[PDB]
């Protein structure tokens, strides 16, 4: 995408989302990041939406294939699961590479830095979902470390209802439950996050209230599933 203008890449990413062409969307946003400038709030959301949708489809396919493979236990199911897994790992590696070169290091405001570190935790978490080898523990720890740095910044710099702070806590709680084998930590984090947000809702406008309560409902939905 080196020959296309930054503004054109952003415009086409928005069009690709409307057309539900998320692979295109991610390619346009990768091109935009590689222009080397920082991303605005809206542009960070375009980047996240694009890759979250691409990897989300890969994860769903990997889970279908992994279920078939486990029931089976020719080489075809394992080979095809391995092919999907390698493609998923490649996308995660691409996103992590964008964050490392150089989105995180240039992000000084709490909102941007937390957003990118939450993404870093997420993409290591997706790698951890499929990991089995010598590096599985290290992948899990890399997710944990990214989420923890994001949490530390968010608690110092953002109110407890901030939607990025809330989504980070939601995702880190999923990490604890599904990856780290720490369901009590997951439940504690979701509960404390929910309760501290509830007590700050009185400060919010109607539109901010809507955002915060929508994510609080996701925390509650997980708590209902886990308890």
């Amino acid at each position: 995408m080196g020959s296309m203008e930054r503004a054109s890449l952003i415009q086409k990413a928005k069009l690709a989302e409307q057309a539900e062409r998320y692979e295109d969307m991610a390619a346009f946003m990768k091109g935009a990041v590689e222009k080397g400038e920082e991303l605005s709030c809206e542009e960070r959301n375009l980047l996240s939406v694009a890759y979250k949708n691409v990897v989300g489809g890969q994860r769903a396919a990997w889970r279908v294939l992994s279920s078939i493979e486990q029931k089976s236990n020719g080489p075809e199911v394992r080979e095809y699961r391995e092919k999907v897994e390698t493609e998923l790992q490649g996308v995660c590696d691409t996103v992590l590479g964008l964050l490392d070169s150089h989105l995180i290091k240039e992000a000084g405001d709490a909102e941007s830095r937390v957003f990118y570190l939450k993404m870093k935790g997420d993409y290591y978490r997706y790698l951890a979902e499929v990991a089995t080898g010598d590096d599985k523990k290290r992948i899990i720890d890399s997710a944990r470390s990214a989420y923890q740095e994001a949490m530390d910044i968010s608690k110092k710099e953002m109110p407890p209802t901030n939607p990025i702070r809330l989504g980070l806590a939601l995702n880190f709680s999923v990490f604890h439950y599904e990856i780290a084998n720490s369901p009590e930590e997951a439940i504690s984090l979701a509960k404390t996050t929910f309760d501290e947000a509830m007590a700050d809702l009185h400060t919010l406008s109607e539109d901010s209230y809507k955002d915060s309560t929508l994510i609080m409902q996701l925390l509650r939905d997980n708590l209902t599933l886990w308890t």
Partner: peptide, 9 residues
């Protein structure tokens, strides 16, 4: 368990 969606929808 659900993680955050890409959009409010």
């Amino acid at each position: 368990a659900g993680s955050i969606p890409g959009r409010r929808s």
